[PDB]
Amino acid sequence: PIKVYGQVSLNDSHNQMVVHWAGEKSNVIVALARDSLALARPKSSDVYVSYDYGKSFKKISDKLNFGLGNRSEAVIAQFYHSPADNKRYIFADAYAQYLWITFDFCNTLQGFSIPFRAADLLLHSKASNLLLGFDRSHPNKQLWKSDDFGQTWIMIQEHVKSFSWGIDPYDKPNTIYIERHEPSGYSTVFRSTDFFQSRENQEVILEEVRDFQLRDKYMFATKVVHLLGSEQQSSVQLWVSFGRKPMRAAQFVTRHPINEYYIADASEDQVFVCVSHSNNRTNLYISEAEGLKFSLSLENVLYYSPGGAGSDTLVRYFANEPFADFHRVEGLQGVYIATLINGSMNEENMRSVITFDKGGTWEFLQAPAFTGYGEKINCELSQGCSLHLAQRLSQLLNLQLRRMPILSKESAPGLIIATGSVGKNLASKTNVYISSSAGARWREALPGPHYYTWGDHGGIITAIAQGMETNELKYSTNEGETWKTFIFSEKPVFVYGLLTEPGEKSTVFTIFGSNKENVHSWLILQVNATDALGVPCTENDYKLWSPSDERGNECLLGHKTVFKRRTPHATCFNGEDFDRPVVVSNCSCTREDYECDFGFKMSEDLSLEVCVPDPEFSGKSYSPPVPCPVGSTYRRTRGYRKISGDTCSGGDVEARLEGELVP
Template identity: 35%
Template sequence: MGSQTAVLTICLFLIINLTYITSTTLSGTSDVSVNGKTKIYEAEVSPSNDHHTLRKRDVGKEFHKSNITTKVNQLNDSHQQLMVHWAGEGSDVVICLAKDSNTANFAKPSAVYISYNYGDSFDNKTEFFKFSQPDGKPVFASIDKFFTHPKFISHLVFLDIVHKVIFTTTDYGKSFKYYSLSFNPVDISFHPENPSLFLIHDDKHSLWVTTDFGMTWSRNQEFVKVYFWVVEDNGEQYLVVQREEPTTSSVIAVTGLLPGQTSSLSLVIRDVVDLWVKGEFMFVTRKDPKDAQSLDLLVSHKRGEFKKAVFQSELRCQAYHIVDADSVRVMVAVSHSEYMANLYVSELISDSNDIKFSLSLERVFCYFQDKMWTDSWLRLQSNVKDEKEPRIHFDLSDKSFADVHKVEGMKGIYIASQVLDTVGINPGVEHLRSVITFDWGGEWRPIAAPHYSSDHQPIQCNAANNCSLHLSQKFAQMYPVTRAAPILSSKSAPGVILATGTLGSSLKGHVGLYMSQDAGLTWSQILQEYYLFNFGDHGGVLVAVKYFKSNGETNILKYSTDEGESWKDHAFTDEDLRIYGLMTEPGENTTIFTMFGSARSQHQWLIVKVDLKNAFTYNCTPDDYKFWSPSSGDEGVKMTCILGVKETYERRVPHSNCYNGKDYDRPIKMEVCPCDAEDFECDFGFDRAVGMAQCIRNKKTLYNPYAVPEWCQPGQFYNRTKGYLKIEGDACVGGRDRHFLPDLLPCPYDERKEFLLLAQKDRIVRFDLATLQREELPIKGLQNVIAVDFDIHNNCVYWADIINDTISRQCLGKDNTNTSEILVENDLSSVEGMALDWMSNMLYFVDGIKCRIEVIRTDIDHEGRMRYTVLGPSVLRKPRGIAVHPAAGYMYWTDWAVGDPCVSRASLDGSGVKRLFGKPDVEWPNGITIDFIAERIYFVDAHEDFIGSADLDGKHFRKIIHNKEEVTHPFAVAVFKDIMYWDDWKQNGLYSADKDHGVSIRAIDTNLPGL
C-alpha cells in the first residue's frame, strides 16, 4: 500500500501499519497523518526518453527575484516516477526515489536522492544500491518503495522486490547495509517502539520477523491475509492477524515478538471474511447465514466483544468502507448493489447486543473492486496505468474508497460526493454532486456557491435554480478527463479549505480554485482553471501553480498572504516547466514550498524550492490576531456552534501581512451552546428525506420505535423517541432540546384502546383505530357539534354545540352511562374549536363570531370556572381551529380573516403573538393539531385544498397532501403515531394517510353526513 510511516495516537489503540493485500469486502480511509509525509508524482515520458542514465547531478541554481528565494535542483534523472518523503519532526531530510511505474520497465535500476539541508541540494545515493548478484555480476537495485519507522525517523528500509534484497539505514541514508532474502518481499511494517524489529509480508502470504534490523529472519505466521500493529493504553504491543487457512479464516492476536519474549497466540474471532482496524475499533465481515450474497459487519470497541452492526435498511449489504471512527462513533459506507452505496453513522456505543447505524446519506459515491462499478472505467483504472497521461499518482493498491473528505482541524464536518439519480454503468463527473455536513452526518446540504467570481463578476448560482458548488475528491482525481487535485484542509489552519470545484448541478463544468475561510459555510472563487495548490505558515500564505495536465507549462508560482483576496506572481525560473507536483512539509506550518517537474523539451526531474518568508513584512504581534469561529450571518447556513460547542480560534487578521512562524501555537477557546436542531441526528428507524430537515420514520423497516419496551413494568418509565438522537460528543445544554429529546412516559398498567373522535352534527362517534369500527357515544341532546376534545386521564369528552351555544362535558363510566354537564352556557356565539390543556386542566375554546379565544378551569365547580379571555378582537378576526402544547407552553390557531388569513402562535397566556403563515400560503385555514412525537403542527386549508405541516416555530413548512380529491374541503385534522386523519365536508368522508409523505391515502368512511 505504499509507505505507512506516521503515528496515529489514540486512547486505546495505536494503528501503525497494514499490509499490501486489499480486502474486497472491508476497507477504510487512512488518516491524513498516515500518508501526509510521502507523495508520488508521475511525469509524461515519451518513448524516446525510455532510457535512464545515472549522471552527475547538476549544482542547483539560485534565484533572488522580488526578495523571494528560489533554489532549482536538476537531478538529471529521467525516471517516470518520483516518490518524495519528508522526514519531518524537526529534521531537514528529504528523500526522493526515482523509478519507473511501467511494469515493463520494472527490473530497470532506480535512483535515490537525499537532501540534508531541507531541499537546497540533493546527494545522489544510487551507488549505495549497487550490489553483486549470486553469479558475481554487479547490478543496481530496482527499489520499488521504502519505509520509515514512525518514531525513529532516521531508520529506513528500501525494498527491491525484483532481486529479493533490502537496504537498511539508521542515519538517514548516510550509510547503508543490504541483505539478500530467501523469500519474495512485498510489504514492510515496523514495530511501533523497537526500531530493530520489523515484519515482511511475502508473496506466499507468510509473515517474517527480524529483531536485528534485517540481518536475520524467521517465519512467524503463515496464511496471513492482513495484519495490524496494535498498542494498548498500558503500553502493550501486539499484532492482530487475519489467517486465511484452507478450511477456515480467523483473527488471532500475536504477542511476545520482542527479543527475550516467548511468542504466543490467542484467538480473537473465527469465521471471518475480512478484517480492518481503525482507532479504538476492530471490524470484521462475516457471511450472513440467511443470505449467501450478503455480509454482516461485526464491531469490537476497545477490545470488547464483537457486536453485530444493524443498519437502518432492508437492502443487502455486500461490502463496507470505514470512513471515520472517532471515540465512540463510526461512519461507514455500505455497498448495497453494483451502483448503490449509502452512508451510515452509528449511535452511541452502548452495552446492548448490537450497534445500530442510522442512515446518514443516500447514494454516496463509493468504489469496491469486484463489487461496484465493475464495468466502468474505474475497474480499468485500478489495473492499468496510462503511460501518456501525467498525473499526481495515488496509491492504486488501495482499491476501495469512499468520496468523503473529513475537514481536518474541525469536528464533525465532512464533504461527500453523492451520485445523482440518473447514472449509467460508466459514471462521470456529470453524475456527481457535492454536499456538506456540520454535525457528523446528521444533516447534509448543498455547498453554497460564492456570490462573485475571481474577477469580481456576479455569480447567479443558488439552490432555487439547482445550482451549488461541487468539489473534486478522489473520483475527480482519478477521472481521466479531469485529474483534479483533491480537497485540502489541515489542523494547522482550522477552518481553511482549498479545493478544485465547479458551479452548477454537478461536478461537470468550468473549473476553478475555491476557498472557504469558515470551515465550508461560505466560499470564494480565487482562481480559474486547474491548479495545484497548498498553504503554509498555518494558513497565512496560499500558493498555486498551473497544473500541467490542463494548463501546460509555467514558470509562475502564485501566492497570497491575505487569504486569497489578492495574488502575486513569482517567476521561479527563466523558462516554462512542466509541473507535476507541489508540496510542503506535512503540517503546513512553514513558508517553504517545493515543486516537482521537468523541462518541456526533454524529461529530466527538476526540484524547485521556493521560500516565501520574505513575502511577509514583519513577525506577527498580538495585535495582528483575532478570535474566529465558523459562522455565517446568511440565513440557512449559520453554524456558530459545532457539536454543541462554539470553538473560537485565534487567526491572523487577513490584511496583517505578518509571519506566524513555524512554532506558532494557536490558542483555542471553548463555549458551550444552547441546543438546536443541528445538535441532533436521526434516531434508529428514522431518516432525513432529501430537502427535509425533519427526521421521519422509515416505514420500510419492521422496527417500531414507538413500541413500549418489553421490560417496561407498571410503576417504571421509558423513553419514547421523537425521532432524534443527540449527537455523541455534542456538548450543548438547554436551548430547544425539548423539541428533540425523547418523552419520559410511564409504563402502562393496561393496554388502552386507541381511538379517534369525530363530531357528526347531532352525535359524536368514536372510531377504534385497530378495527376502524365506529361507535356512537351515549350523549343526549346534541344538535350541531363542531368542536370536540377528550380527557384521557379522566375518560371525559368535551364538546361545543353551536345551536344552543354551550360547552359541555360527559365523563364516561365503564358502561358509558354517565350524564353530561354544561360548563359554559352564556356569552357564546359560535364555538369553532377547542383544545384541552391536560397538564393544568384548562380548556381553551375559540368563538368565531365574537373573535375571542377564552379559557376555563375544568377541575373546579365555581361559577364561571375562572373564565377569562386570552385573546380578543384586537388580534383575531375570524378564528377557527385551535391546538395547545402544554409542555411547550404554546397555543396555535387559524384565522379566516378576509384578505388577511393566518396561522398564528402565542404563549398559553396570550402573550408573544407570532404570525407563522399568511397569504399566499393560506386562504381558509381550518383545523389545526399538534404531532407531539415529531413536535410539529398540522393544519388544513379549505380554499387551497391542502394539508400542511411545519415545526413548532413555523419553519420547514411543506404540503403533505394537496390537489387531491380527498382534500377538496378539509375541515379537521388529527395525528397519531405515523398516521394523520382528516375529514372533508365536501366528500362527507373520513380519511387517513402517511403523515410524512401523504402516501397510502385510505378512505375510512365516506358516508358521514353532518360533518
C-alpha cells in the same frame, strides 16, 4: 519579496519520484526516482539525498552495491522510514533477497542480506528495532519478525493473508493481530502478545470472517450467514466491537438484503458506513457511541466497488485511489462533504452536499454570489447551480496530473481550497473555490485549474497553472482576496507538482518540473517566501474562531472549541511554531452543566452522566397523571434540567434528544 535559492538539475528520465522530508530540526530530503508504476517490475531506480534542505542533490546509488564478488547493479523498489526514529532508513530490492540499511541520515549504508523477498515491511511505530515482513508471491504465505532491524528474521506464522500491529492505548505492546487462510476460502483472526511462540499467550477473536479491519478504537469484521449456514438468503453481517470487547452484532433493518459494507470514517466515537450494493442503492448509515444503533443518514452516495478476490465484500483501500467520494474536513469534528448520484457508472451528475453536525443535516453547497475580477454571476433557484466540488474518482479523462483534490490540513483549520464548478453538475471549465470559514462561505479565487498549496500555517497560499508551459507563481496572503505574481525562471517550464514539507511551518516551496526537452530532466526549484510575510506577529493580529455554521451560528454538537487564528488581512509571520484551543469550552449550556432534579441520585458510573431517582423508593415514583410533573401531553427528559441563565440555541445534542412531548 520572494527569492529562489535552489535550482537543481537531475540527469534522469524516470517517470515517477517519491520524496521524503526527514525530521523536524534536520534538513534532509531523500528522493527515489523509480520507474513506471505499481503495475510490473521496475527496470531502473536512483536515490538522491540532500543535507541542506534541498539546496543541492547528490546521487548516492553508488553506495547501494551487492558487495564484492557481484557486479550486478541493484534496483530499489521502495524505501521505508522508521516512524519512531528519523535517522534510520531501509532500502529493499525487487529482484534479489537483500536489504540495505543506514543509521544516520543515509550517510553510511550497510549490506545486510535476508531471506524471502521484501514485499511489505511494517516498521513498528514506537520501537525502531522491531519489524515484520511479508512475501505475498510465496505459494505458502509466510510471516517474518526481525528484532535487529534486518539481520535475523525468524518464522512466526504461515498461511497469512493480512496482519497488523496494535494501537497503543487499548492493547499491550508487541501485540499482533493476524488473519489466517483456511481450506474453504475463509479466515480466522488471532491476537497474541508473544510473537506466536506459546499457546498460553494466544487468543482467538472470531472465525470464518470474510474481511477484517482495525481502526483506532473500533474493530470491524464481515462474515457470511444462512443460505451458507442454514437457509433463506446469504446477507453478509457486520460485527463491530469497541474497547476490544468481544465482537457483538449490528442491526440494519431494511427491506432489501445487504451485500456490502464500507467503513468510511470511524474515529470520533462515531462511524459512517457506506452500506449497500443491493439493487444499486448505497445508503450512508450513521450510529452513535453504543456502536450498534445504525440509522439512515443519506440516500444514495456514489460508491465504487469492483469487488475482491471473487468473494471479498469489505474493501481495503490505499492512498492511490479511494473507493468512496467522502471527505472529512480535517481538524474539525462534524464537517463532511459527500456527493450524491443517480446514475450507474456515469460522471456528469455530481451533486455535492455538506453537514456541520455529525451528518445530521445534509445541505447543498453555497455559491460565491459574485466572481473574481468583478462580476455579478450567480444563481440559486433552490435547485440551480450550487457549488459542485471535485472528489477523486472516474479519473475524468486520461489527462496529465489533473483534478487536485479538496485540500484541508489540521494545521490551518477552516481553510478548504477545492476545485469545482458552479451549475447543475461538475462538467469542465473548473475553478478554485477557497473558503476560510470551514466551508460555510465560499469564494472564486483563481480562474482555471491550478496547482495550489499553502505554507506557514495557511499563512501564504500559492498556485501554479497547469496545462501549458508557465513561469508564474501566484502567491497570496489575503486567503484568496488578492493574488500577486512571481517569476521563478526565465524560460517557461512544464510543472508536474507543487509541493512543500508535510505539515507546516515551512515557508520554502518546492517545484518539480521538467525543462523544455526530452522528458524528463526532473528539475527541482526551491522558492523561499519568508520575506513576503513581513514581520513577527503580535497579539492584535490574532483573534478567536469557532466552527461558523451554515444554517447559522457555530452553535451546536455538545460543547465548542475555539482556535486562535490570525486575521484575514494582517500580514505577519504566524510564527513557524504554536496554537491551541487553550479552552475546550466544556459546554455552553449543555452536557457538562446538566443534572437531574436534586434528591434524585446520580449514577455510580462516570461514563453515563445520567440521573436516577432511587431504588429505595420501591418503584412508587411511577404514578398516574395526578401530580404536576406528569399529565396530558407531558414533556419527557432523562432527568435533565436547564439551569437559569443558560441561554444556548441550536445543536444536535439538545435536538431530537431532550424534552419530547408525549401524551
